[PDB]
Amino acid sequence: RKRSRKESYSIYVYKVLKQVHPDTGISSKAMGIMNSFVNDIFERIAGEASRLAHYNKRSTITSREIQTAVRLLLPGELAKHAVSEGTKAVTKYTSAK
Amino acid sequence: RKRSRKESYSIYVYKVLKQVHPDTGISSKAMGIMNSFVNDIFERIAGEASRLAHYNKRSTITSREIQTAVRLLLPGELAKHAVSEGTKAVTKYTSAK
Amino acid sequence: RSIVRTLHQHKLGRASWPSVQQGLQQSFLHTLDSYRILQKAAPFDRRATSLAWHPTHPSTVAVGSKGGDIMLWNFGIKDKPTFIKGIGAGGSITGLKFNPLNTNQFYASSMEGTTRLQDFKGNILRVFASSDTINIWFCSLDVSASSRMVVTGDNVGNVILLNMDGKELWNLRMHKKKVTHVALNPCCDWFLATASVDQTVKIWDLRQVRGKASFLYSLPHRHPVNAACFSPDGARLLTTDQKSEIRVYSASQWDCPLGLIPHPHRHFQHLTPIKAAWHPRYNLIVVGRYPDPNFKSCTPYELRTIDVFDGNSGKMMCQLYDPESSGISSLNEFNPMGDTLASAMGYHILIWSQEEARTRK
Amino acid sequence: VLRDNIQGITKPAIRRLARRGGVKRISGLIYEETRGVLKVFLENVIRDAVTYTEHAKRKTVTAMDVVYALKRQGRTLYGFGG
Amino acid sequence: RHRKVLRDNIQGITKPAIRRLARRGGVKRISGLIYEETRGVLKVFLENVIRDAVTYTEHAKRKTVTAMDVVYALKRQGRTLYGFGG
Amino acid sequence: VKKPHRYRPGTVALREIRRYQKSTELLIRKLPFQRLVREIAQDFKTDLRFQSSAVMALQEACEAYLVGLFEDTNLCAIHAKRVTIMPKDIQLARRIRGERA
Amino acid sequence: VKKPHRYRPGTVALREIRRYQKSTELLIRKLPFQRLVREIAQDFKTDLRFQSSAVMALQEACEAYLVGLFEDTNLCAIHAKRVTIMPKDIQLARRIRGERA
Amino acid sequence: KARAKAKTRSSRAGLQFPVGRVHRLLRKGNYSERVGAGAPVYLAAVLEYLTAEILELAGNAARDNKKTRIIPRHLQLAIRNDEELNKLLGRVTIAQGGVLPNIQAVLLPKKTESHHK
Amino acid sequence: KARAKAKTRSSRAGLQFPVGRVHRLLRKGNYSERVGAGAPVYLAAVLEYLTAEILELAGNAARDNKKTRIIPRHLQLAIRNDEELNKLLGRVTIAQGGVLPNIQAVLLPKKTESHHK
DNA sequence: ATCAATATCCACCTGCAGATTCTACCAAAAGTGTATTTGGAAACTGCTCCATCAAAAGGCATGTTCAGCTGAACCAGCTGAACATGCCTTTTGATGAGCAGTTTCCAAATACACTTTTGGTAGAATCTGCAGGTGGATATTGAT
DNA sequence: ATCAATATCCACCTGCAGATTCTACCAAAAGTGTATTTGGAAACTGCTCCATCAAAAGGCATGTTCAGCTGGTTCAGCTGAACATGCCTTTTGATGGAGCAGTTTCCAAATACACTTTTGGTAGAATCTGCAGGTGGATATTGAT
């Protein structure tokens, strides 16, 4: 009867997996690893963005701050593709306000 | 009406130095080092307390949270002495009310 | 290519004066590469700051030192060049110009804040301006004999205009910052162009502008401007900026520039500001080079050389470089005859003349 | 001799862990040293986990507690929440 | 001139300087090839720290690399530097 | 057949290396580790319980750290023109990393 | 007596070790390090300016890092029954610590 | 009353990861007093791309082993074979992952083995 | 009506460090929505104790070298000669800090001179 | 083993370049008075963990044994150490302009209150990879 | 008169633990509004950063000698890896109890917010004085006899 509602990123990870490899499944334990990975990167990027905000005496976390956080955490060519994807996402979102 | 004000921990560090060694002086670079040390340890303990408040779904930072943060961060016997000093300080403060 | 065929072709009158001038200029460039030899040089205490050519005498050159020393150097005489010692602290002669009437005097603008008329023998005749106050000095200076006017600028942006006998009616501020150069046109005698650190050049007509900084035009510039010099014919204004750009403006539509000539002459506290100069009897522009790691240089050799361009086409035509003088040639002023070039390197003054003509018996 | 529960980490198990790590020949004295190293590491992790659980007014060392304890040492662990 | 003192670069760190650093660390005898590897490692470390500092300065829209930028860049990697601000 | 098939020293070791590198099941036994963890806990505080997941996490972290230390120890051992891991190698590996504690 | 006083190999090495561990003066000269830092800054952005304090911080950090690395390297060299540090010692130290090499 | 048919901010941005959820987690978490509209979209896109990369490499690893389900072992191979990801997750231990095959050359024996009798 | 004389929170707790300043820095900095009354005093006390320990060791080191003033070197020796402080600040560099004079034994000249041919 | 060149330890003696020590003040702290939350007591459920029983059965403690490894002892050959000396290269003091560092505003942005509805999930029915079990089929490493 | 223990490795087949998909519910997310607030653009300004040419003072790049470390080559001896055996500790199941980790609800200390009064750091001058740099000796290091 009584039970809380756990919030996870399982369904969205499954959707992405279906996108990249339609005929493939993921175990529950792999799903746990993916959930931990998503949460960890969220915390890393958010923390670096928050520091970047406070360091410049700013109080709002804008897209520029997350851009710099991504530039700072990720290595090599991973940063380029990720920044491009984020830029496309924000451009699409704002173009259809 | 320009008036710069750079807040620092120099005066308090000097007071403590005289308390623990009256016939001693501190160089400006030494005072900068002590300033950095104080700020670093403050950030460490405060951030650990913030993290603890989040895990337990607690919306406030109380003396218990700082105590647990100190226990986590500081090593060895420096933890026992620091916690004893904190408990003595808090009991002295409350007894004054 | 048709080195000698063109002059005879002219002589019949088939060629107009401009084509003859073009040919003579080409001959000048062709001979310029034999000038490479440095005939003479001379030391004195500190960095050289000012260079002035004797209007008539073709061997007398005047150079000032950052410490207030003035040297009259007539080449080939070995007369122990006249030297006037200075204070040495802030006596820098920011600008030197002979008195057109009596060549034995000169108009010298100094960091003291005193643009003065002084005889080369040493005695000071008369001081034209003195703003006192220490953090107010004079930087610019120009004299027009035709109208007998003397113009001098200040460090703040207020220029002064004085007669050769005094009675200034001027001192109206025209720039928000230091006024670097003021040039009185040779052809006309009433309109003046001034370059400042405000990053703007303003052209005035002293006979008609008196209404609270009423300027004929404003010439915006991306960076500070060091010099704004007119062609001897007075039909072109050559403007030198501080990072890398040279602009030429014609009397037709003063505002727009004829050509942008990229050239590295970056600024330095301890370097005499680099100034491009006009060739008295041709359409050539002479200016030194100051290499930059960030500047775009296609050639594999990045050397400190005195470049020569052409006023119209805006392309390089010749370069001067002789090792053993690899310093930075801040100033470069041609001899009025156009035969000798005098350069102001740091602590050394260079003359790029050549030997004489055929020998007698 | 008292077992002390540290001998519960048997010698063959140490051989297996060493084999997976790329070694080929084990000197005799490696066993005591590895037992000591493991004891120190476990002491650190359990101390941090116990501090966390005590602060929460609990009596069960949750999985999240050990995961958080490993975060501090820079040994982040994936698979048990986060 | 094309001075380029042996590389115009990391090769400007004279051999006695690497010897002095090694001696401060307790090194007694040094092999001949150690110098080039030391220069390489220094170059990599400097590249990383400078990249972090330059990102910081670019974010604030500044034309200077402030000291606090280098301090925070080092703190990112875990080499906090005491004595320049915090 | 005077003697049976006797693999030379090393070959079985290499086979075991392959077998345990191709696998992922835990190498430490469950009950001994549980008892050891509970001993350490009772040392730090009395009457403490453990979720099975917590003990699993401890096992995973300990095994991962130990295998990493063994990789570094082997790297050090080869450096010394040897193929044997000795305590001095573990000491050096822990010292360089900064794990003196 | 005609033979000139010649210090035997090593007696200067230890003296330099003591001298440079008892002091704190920066060992890398200002100008070469400044030029190096500025050159590496070109690749990431053009027209950058460095505060003197920023370059001093970079020098301090680089010298400290190199001193630490040389300490760990010398420790590796001893473990190999040697007194001379060679490049493979640097490579092993960096591998163990966690850097690329 | 208009009540335009609600479209998720994820759909507006063409993303699979939620955009509202990241905005909520940023608001609650004391990362900063204010969170902008563009921040959640950018962060969701970044997370989606990283997940896509790791999952694609893991799936490629699975196909090489004739396995159609991604188990924890595969993610370890994906992360520890690609240098950039290894840098990103160099200080993370994957549950039930194992280690990459690696045997130092000094250990491998002499190669003399061929029919000679 | 009374407005008792203002008494500093530092005096109440008998600490030389500013309790009010730590409160202000905790509020501005977003460590948590609310800051309890007793947290700042505890944190100030901890900072004071650690500062006192470091300065005491630094002064002892200074007296060792026959100097009345604490320069950055003397802090380095204090931090590096005490185990607990060395561990708390094991990943930190001190401007003009220097290093301990430790020298490995094998490098020292071999005084074990025995019978030789 | 005397001795004979250095280095380093001392030990006075200035003077000046930073440190202490006076100010004024204003921004931040402290003192009342309400509002408004936390979080902690107190009472539940029922979920997970402690044990504790079987029975294996798979692992390990346990002795031979001998094959390869690890450490000595010299040994030749070379390569870093040490000094000697001119020659760079670094270091540094001469009296402009850029830009970091603060004020001050809005227009744009984000936040804050209710409302509608909808993807989010509690758990339940299905499918179904593949773990595990036979069987060959080679394959490697070690014995004439 | 190089094949054999053990392995690896593939091919195939079957059932179920355990993923996938599918009902339903409802907690957050949008949507529509009204209210704060505050990021970046003018504006300024005062510290300080860019980098040349003399002049000079020190380090150092370049060549000898040559002491000693250092890879290499033999050699014992030791020792641990491999294998055979029989006990025995550890896995799978259990079956409950039950301790207490979560889940509701209530309200009273606790802290926020806000103003208004107060005085404690802090930015400048003043001046006070460790000690860095000299000057000399006295002693210990070190070294080839």
Author numbering:
A (entry chain D), B (entry chain H): 30 to 126
C (entry chain L): 67 to 427
D (entry chain F): 22 to 103
E (entry chain B): 18 to 103
F (entry chain E), G (entry chain A): 36 to 136
H (entry chain C), I (entry chain G): 10 to 126
Please share excerpts from the published article on this structure:
We prepared the nucleosome core particle (NCP) containing a CPD at a position 22-23 base-pairs from the nucleosomal dyad, corresponding to the SHL−2 position (NCPCPD). The UV-DDB-NCPCPD complex was reconstituted in vitro and subjected to the cryo-EM single particle analysis. We then determined the cryo-EM structure of the UV-DDB-NCPCPD complex at 3.4 Å resolution. In the UV-DDB-NCPCPD structure, the F334, Q335, and H336 residues of DDB2 bound to the two orphan bases opposite the lesion. The DDB2 G154, A155, G156, I200, N201, and W203 residues directly contacted the CPD moiety of the nucleosomal DNA. Especially, the DDB2 I200 and N201 residues recognized the two methyl groups of the CPD. In contrast, the I200 and N201 residues that contacted the CPD in the UV-DDB-NCPCPD structure are located away from the lesions in the UV-DDB complexes with nucleosomes containing the 6-4PP or abasic site. The positively charged surface of DDB2, comprising the R112, K132, K244, and Q308 residues, bound to the DNA backbone near the CPD site. In addition, the DDB2 R332, Y356, I394, R370, and Y413 residues interacted with the backbone phosphates of the undamaged strand within the CPD site. In the CPD nucleosome complexed with UV-DDB, the bending angle of the nucleosomal DNA at the CPD site was 53°, while it was 49° for undamaged nucleosomal DNA.
In mammalian global genomic nucleotide excision repair, UV-DDB plays a central role in recognizing DNA lesions, such as 6-4 photoproducts and cyclobutane pyrimidine dimers, within chromatin. Therefore, UV-DDB (DDB1-DDB2/XPE heterodimer complex) is thought to be responsible for recognizing CPD in the genome, and then handover the lesion to XPC. In the eukaryotic genome, 145-147 base-pair DNA segments are wrapped around histone octamers, consisting of two molecules each of the four types of histone proteins, H2A, H2B, H3, and H4, forming the basic unit called the nucleosome. Previous X-ray crystallographic analyses revealed the structures of UV-DDB-damaged DNA complexes, in which DDB2 binds to UV lesions using its positively charged surface.
